[PDB]
DNA sequence: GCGATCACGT
DNA sequence: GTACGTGATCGCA
């Protein structure tokens, strides 16, 4: 049983405890704390938050680094407490991050899922307690208090077996020196948020809305009819039924209207280019203008993203509400959305720094391919150099299309694309793509050795690892379905590359955070997107940041090839280019 | 109201 | 067809 507590007592404030600070709303920013449980050597306690969070001794305990707490998803609680003006310190074990590191494919999203990994089932899944979707609801205090106490008791019971397995995997330092410190840095970044120029966004959205209606009127002209252009079903009836355009690709219920297909239907009818333009404009208007404006807080005029640290199978961060990694990077108005992201104070600027080709540099290091390593030691343009070797031409003989094809081979490596995906990316046959790949391996035989050796290692051990000992289990590597086996082989090759790059960026973030405080700069980390870090800082700090940030990022790890960082600053994220 | 499906940005 | 997140439509109960 447990103590349903009236007031905070001294025995609730031991120097080691499992702690539950429950935030039930999915978006925890400025969200209610619905209850608190503490389990320690003296007992098990449920506290009402209006009581506990108004208690000086309990608040002092929360903020005391020397009182150690074990938790699940400590960042959710940290941020919810930041919005109440309360600091959470001393979190020495995060069970969500521990479960993530042990097996990211398990999907661990609550205490019960993690507990089941160790045959502990005396805790319910959150979904069984709070309900799903519309029916979601905080239950009565007796049901709530038992749930929170069972979650804390599970965290209390599970710390030792989880830490023991992490230690056997050589992942104990990964948890304690990388993922957990990063969790606190991410909490600060989310809480600070990023200032959005909403008038600029609304002005962009008004541009699009008038452009969209011009294109949309033109499409109804060439259609001889009005129809929902945003319905791929109705658009198929207009294209392939009414206008009798060739069906080149089939979807599983009707006709494909992908941008891939439409670009090749373009010579046949003027409607097609107008559909393509409508699709561009409408994606910007719906996903990025209206999408962003919906998640800007009117109190702060900021967006406060939520970074998901325990989701991807490579170790990269993901982010939501908004997903600021999805912001377009190709077109002109694509990245012009980034004009809307501004410093949060007068006379501050945005500073952005990004790793140049970190994935291919990591590959050069892991594969120890002499040709790849030398190209980076000479700081060559890697796509031009790849074209030179594959086609055996001098630099001045590399045509733009040759460089494009080499760049597509290189991107297929960074992102693990199939050779059918290479064919599909280059609009060539599978046989031609295969010959492309063999010429690459003729030029980079160390990369070929690495690809063969890592697949054999994944088959032997059952998993692959990154430079900082993240692992990914690959049970499909021995499957008899060719497509299932092939995807697992590509993941064996890709995860050490993408996940080691993720490791390096996370270590750079931790090193940068420490250096900024050591230097007593006001500069603050705001975002991590792709291979880039974004900060804001007083304009009087730019010259110092120009030396400090690239140095910290370049020295985060020592590889057989240099790490290279490009950096810029400006009055907006766009202009930090 | 929720799930499957399509499309598009990463 | 890499890692993912989002929006729109559709057609269910
Ligand atoms: N599929 C992808 N996954 C992750 N990062 C990507 C992907 N495609 C492009 N990027 C990178 C490159 C940039 O650093 C950033 C977005 O800019 P762009 O657009 O490309 O993310």
Q: What does the DSSP 8-state code read for residue A240?
A: I
Known binder of ligand: residue A354? Answer: yes
Q: What is the CATH number of domain A196-303?
A: 1.20.1060.10
DSSP A308: E
Helices (H) and strands (E) in chain A, counts: 24, 17
| CA A380/CA A375 separation, integer angstroms | 5
Gap between the Cα atoms of A437 and A413, Å rounded: 10
| From-to residues of CATH 1.10.150.20 in chain A | 359-501
CA distance A348 to A545: 13
Instruction: List beta partners, residue A250.
Output: A255
Q: Which residues have CB under 8 Å from A294's CB, separation 6+?
A: none
Whether A8 contacts A20, CB under 8 Å: no
Residues after which a C–N gap over 2.5 Å breaks chain A: none
Q: For residue A133, with 0-12 CB atoms within 10 Å meaning exposed, 13-18 middle and 19 or more buried, which class applies? A: exposed
Sorted by sequence, the CB contacts under 8 Å of residue A517 that are 6+ apart come out as none
Indicate where chain A has its CATH 1.20.1060.10 domain(s): 196-303
Structure determined by:
X-ray
Work out the number of other CB atoms within 10 angstroms of the CB of residue A34. 18
DSSP A415-428: TT--HHHHHHHHT-
What's A229's DSSP letter? T
d(CA A528, CA A317): 8
For strand C, give the nucleotides within 7 A of a protein CB.
1-11
Q: Residue A71: which of A28, A114, A131 has the closest Cα?
A: A114
Phi then psi dihedrals of residue A266, to 5 deg: -55, -40
Assign domain A359-501 to its CATH superfamily.
5' to 3' exonuclease, C-terminal subdomain (1.10.150.20)
The CB of A135 under 6 Å from ligand 1? The reply is no
Please state the CATH superfamily assignment of the domain spanning residues A3-194 in this structure. Ribonuclease H-like superfamily/Ribonuclease H (3.30.420.10)
Q: How many angstroms is C1' of B3 away from CA of A294?
A: 24
Q: Which helix (H) or strand (E) holds A544?
A: helix A542-554
In this structure, the residue with its CA closest to atom 21 of ligand 1 is A530
Contact A536, A349 (CB under 8 A): yes
Strands (E), A13-130: 16-22, 35-40, 43-47, 68-71, 91-94
Q: Cα–Cα distance between A187 and A199 in angstroms, integer? A: 28
Residue A559 assigned to a binding site: yes
Burial classification of residue A43, based on how many CB atoms lie within 10 Å of its CB (0-12 exposed, 13-18 middle, 19 or more buried): middle
Please state, in angstroms and rounded to a whole number, the distance separating the CA atoms of residues A193 and A202: 20
CB A39 within 8 A of CB A149: yes
- Tell if A16 CB is < 7 Å from nucleic strand B: no
Question: Is A339 one of the annotated binding-site residues?
Answer: no
Beta bridge partners of residue A561, listed in sequence order: none
**Whose Cα sits closest to atom 16 in ligand 1?**
A329
Which residue has tokens 């120009």? A546
Q: Judge if the beta carbon of A234 is closer than 7 A to nucleic acid strand C.
A: yes
| DSSP strand pairing (A348-355 vs A532-538) | antiparallel
Tokens 């150690």 belong to which residue? A68
**Where do you find CATH 3.30.420.10 in chain A?**
3-194
DSSP notation for A163-212? HHHHHHTT-HHIIIIIIHHHHHHHHHHHHH-EEE-HHHHHHHHHHHHHHH
Nearest-atom index, ligand 1, CA of A354: 14
The Cα A310–Cα A317 span in angstroms is 8
A528: enclosing H helix or E strand = strand A524-529
CA–C1' span, A105 to C3, in Å? 13
């Amino acid at each position: 049983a447990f103590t349903l507590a009236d007031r905070v007592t001294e025995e609730m404030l031991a120097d080691k405890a499992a702690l539950v600070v429950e935030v039930v709303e999915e978006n925890y920013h400025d969200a209610p704390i619905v209850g608190i449980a503490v389990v320690n050597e003296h007992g098990r306690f449920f506290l009402r938050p209006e009581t506990a969070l108004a208690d000086p001794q309990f608040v002092a305990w929360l903020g005391d680094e020397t009182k150690k707490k074990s938790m699940f998803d400590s960042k959710r609680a940290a941020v919810a407490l930041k919005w109440k003006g309360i600091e959470l310190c001393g979190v020495s074990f995060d069970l969500l991050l521990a479960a993530y590191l042990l097996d990211p494919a398990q999907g661990v999203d609550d205490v019960a899922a993690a507990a089941k990994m160790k045959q502990y089932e005396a805790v319910r899944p959150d979904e069984a307690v709070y309900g799903k979707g519309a029916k979601r609801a905080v239950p009565d205090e007796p049901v709530l208090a038992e749930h929170l106490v069972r979650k804390a008791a599970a965290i209390w019971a599970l710390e030792r077996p989880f830490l023991d397995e992490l230690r056997r995997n050589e992942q104990d330092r990964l948890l304690v020196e990388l993922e957990q410190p990063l969790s606190s840095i991410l909490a600060e970044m989310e809480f600070a948020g990023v200032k959005v120029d909403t008038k600029r966004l609304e002005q962009m959205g008004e541009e699009l809305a008038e452009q969209l209606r011009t294109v949309e009127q033109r499409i109804y002209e060439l259609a001889g009819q009005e129809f929902n252009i945003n319905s791929p079903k109705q658009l198929g009836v207009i294209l392939f039924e009414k206008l009798q355009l060739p069906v080149l690709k089939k979807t599983k219920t009707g006709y494909s209207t992908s941008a891939d297909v439409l670009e090749k239907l373009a010579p046949y009818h003027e409607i097609v280019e107008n559909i393509l333009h409508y699709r561009q404009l409408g994606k910007l208007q719906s996903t990025y203008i209206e999408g962003l404006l919906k998640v800007v807080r009117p109190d702060t005029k900021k967006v406060h993203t939520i970074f998901n640290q325990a989701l991807t199978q490579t170790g990269r961060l993901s982010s939501t509400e908004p997903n600021l990694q999805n912001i377009p990077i190709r077109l002109e108005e694509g990245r012009k959305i980034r004009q809307a992201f501004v410093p949060s104070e007068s006379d501050w600027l945005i500073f952005a720094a990004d790793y140049s080709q970190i994935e291919l540099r990591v590959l050069a290091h892991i594969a120890e391919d002499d040709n790849l390593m030398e190209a980076f030691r000479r700081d060559l343009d890697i796509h031009t150099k790849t074209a030179m070797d594959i086609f055996q031409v001098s630099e001045d003989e590399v045509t733009p299309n040759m460089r494009r094809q080499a760049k597509a081979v290189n991107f297929g490596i960074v992102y693990g694309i199939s050779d059918y995906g290479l064919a599909q990316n280059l609009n060539i046959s599978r046989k031609e793509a295969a010959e492309f790949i063999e010429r690459y391996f003729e030029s980079f035989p160390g990369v070929k050795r690495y690809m063969e050796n890592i697949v054999q290692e994944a088959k032997q051990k059952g998993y692959v690892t990154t430079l900082l000992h993240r692992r990914r289990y690959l049970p499909d590597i021995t499957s008899r379905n060719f497509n299932v086996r092939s995807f697992a082989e590509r993941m064996a090759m890709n995860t050490p590359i993408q996940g080691s790059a993720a490791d390096i960026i996370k270590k750079a973030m931790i090193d940068l955070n420490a250096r900024l405080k050591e230097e007593r700069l006001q500069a603050r980390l705001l975002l991590q997107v792709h291979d880039e870090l974004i900060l804001e800082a007083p304009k009087e700090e730019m010259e110092r940041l120009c030396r400090l940030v690239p140095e910290v990022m370049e020295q985060a790890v020592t590889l057989r090839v240099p790490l290279k960082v490009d950096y810029h600053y400006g009055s907006t994220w766009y202009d930090a280019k």
